[PDB]
Amino acid sequence: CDNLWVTVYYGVPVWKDADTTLFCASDACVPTDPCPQEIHLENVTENFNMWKNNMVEQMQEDVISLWDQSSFDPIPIHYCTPAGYVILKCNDKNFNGTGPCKNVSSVQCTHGIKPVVSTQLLLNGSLAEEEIIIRSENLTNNAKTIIVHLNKSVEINCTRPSKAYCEINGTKWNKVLKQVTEKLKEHFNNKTIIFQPPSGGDLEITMHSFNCRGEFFYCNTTQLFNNTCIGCNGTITLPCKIKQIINMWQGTGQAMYAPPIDGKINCVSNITGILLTRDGGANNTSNETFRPGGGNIKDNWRSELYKYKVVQIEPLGIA
């Protein structure tokens, strides 16, 4: 069913701003159409918002409906739009996060997005297409989330000996950390950036928590921000704990599990994004403090649904 022949929209706009019910699709969900469609709207300057979009909500609802009904491993899944409506796509290369981009086309279903459930770091995620790009709502309110969209996938190897661990090639770690340091320095009128392990609260935010094969690993990221790095350059192994019993990222309450088997339990993944936070208060100072925190899992879908925005189709649009 390849070929569309007529793939650009000319004339007065024909899409407003709303929000409806979009349904999952993969290969409950439906077969992803193997003939995706795209249409460019020339000389259309558009503006999107990644924090006030009524999508991350539906993603959270589908993820909860997914874990409730539940081998185990993330599945790349789309988000198709009902008839009469269309998803808009911001294809600009270096998108700040919000505001306007001037290269916008319209899909029908989004791209495959595997729902990763982790804090501090983002794994198994699409990389950006140019430089390290930062995203936040307010750059003054230090109690707001902070996303570092990287541009070099870094493999991680979390393994269980049949007190588990995670191996990471530390040289690329030091290099990507130097790059992130460069970009933060730029985004703060060239200030001295400094990092720190997370503060109080449950081990949910103090340790880097993630899911794997059914178990959950909480890692101590002590070394990953050893500022004497900026040894260090050799391959480095973070000891982590297979914490069976967690805090409910399932609504409200808790849950339980069963101890493991005498076999290798291993996840190799791609670190492709970072969740940080900020200190502040006493500033003053010639320094910028940063600890990883985030906490809220919605941020993850935020980080991966920035470019899409639902619109309602109707002719006669008015400028």
Partner: antibody, heavy 131, light 112 residues
Framework: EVQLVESGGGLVKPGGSLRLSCAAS????????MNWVRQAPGRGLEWVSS????????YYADSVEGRFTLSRDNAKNSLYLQMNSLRAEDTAVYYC????????????????????????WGQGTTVTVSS | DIVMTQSPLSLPVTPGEPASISCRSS???????????LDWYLQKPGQSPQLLIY???NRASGVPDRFIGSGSGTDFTLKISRVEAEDVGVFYC????????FGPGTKVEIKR
């Protein structure tokens, strides 16, 4: 009536610009698509562009996209077509003609059949490009 | 795109006996609405084009009933019962499914 009257056209050196206009006079203008259709000397008819009754969904040809621009104001009851930048093969005899519609939902997002009845044609106006 | 063809690319006729020309697309024109998205126009020399048939078979006003449109899907046949010397023109075949497409023309003259 019922008529359309064209204005514009003449010697215009390549790289230049031009504007044609179609003056509508005798029908409910804000109720029909308007279409521009040319004709080279010696060659045959060639559709150029189409625009709807609400000035939406403009379909351009291949040799016309990015260059030409179709505007409209359903109050002055005129058409306007902005030709730029011009090549020597756009030398033609341009025509404006109204056309019924039937908007559709099956062409990805929206899409009407801008043009399916061209009963009332312009008088024709010539446009030459050389040196 | 959609390629359109006509035949015969020239057809001398006689002021009296009937005639018929044909148009074929490369894609069918139906739209699940029952009526075809194809028109039939005429160009008399010097003067601007007219319209003869719109949507498959339906005839525009002013046109005599001697102009019969036929066919559906991919094959279309404009048949004309009886003629005179007013039709010395060029008969064009237009598609209106996706965008707008014309034909190459079917020049018509007198038999001699």
């Amino acid at each position: 009536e019922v008529q359309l009257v064209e204005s514009g056209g003449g010697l215009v050196k390549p790289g230049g610009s031009l504007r044609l206009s179609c003056a509508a006079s005798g029908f409910t203008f804000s109720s029909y698509s308007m279409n521009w259709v040319r004709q080279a000397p010696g060659r045959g008819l060639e559709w150029v562009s189409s625009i709807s009754n609400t000035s939406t969904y403009i379909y351009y040809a291949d040799s016309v996209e990015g260059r030409f621009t179709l505007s409209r104001d359903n109050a002055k009851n005129s058409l306007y077509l902005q030709m730029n930048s011009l090549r020597a093969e756009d030398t033609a005899v341009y025509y404006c003609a109204r056309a019924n519609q039937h908007f559709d939902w099956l062409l990805s997002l929206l899409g009407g059949y801008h043009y399916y009845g061209m009963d009332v044609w312009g008088q024709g106006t010539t446009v030459t490009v050389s040196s | 795109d959609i390629v359109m063809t006509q035949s015969p690319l020239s057809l001398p006729v006689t002021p009296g006996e009937p005639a018929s020309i044909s148009c074929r697309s490369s894609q069918s024109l139906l739209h699940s609405n029952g009526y075809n998205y194809l028109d039939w126009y005429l160009q008399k020399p010097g003067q601007s084009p007219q319209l003869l048939i719109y949507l498959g078979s339906n005839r525009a006003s002013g046109v005599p009933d001697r102009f019969i449109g036929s066919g559906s899907g991919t094959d279309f046949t404009l048949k004309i019962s009886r003629v005179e010397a007013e039709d010395v023109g060029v008969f064009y075949c237009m598609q209106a499914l996706q965008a707008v497409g014309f034909g190459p023309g079917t020049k018509v003259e007198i038999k001699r």
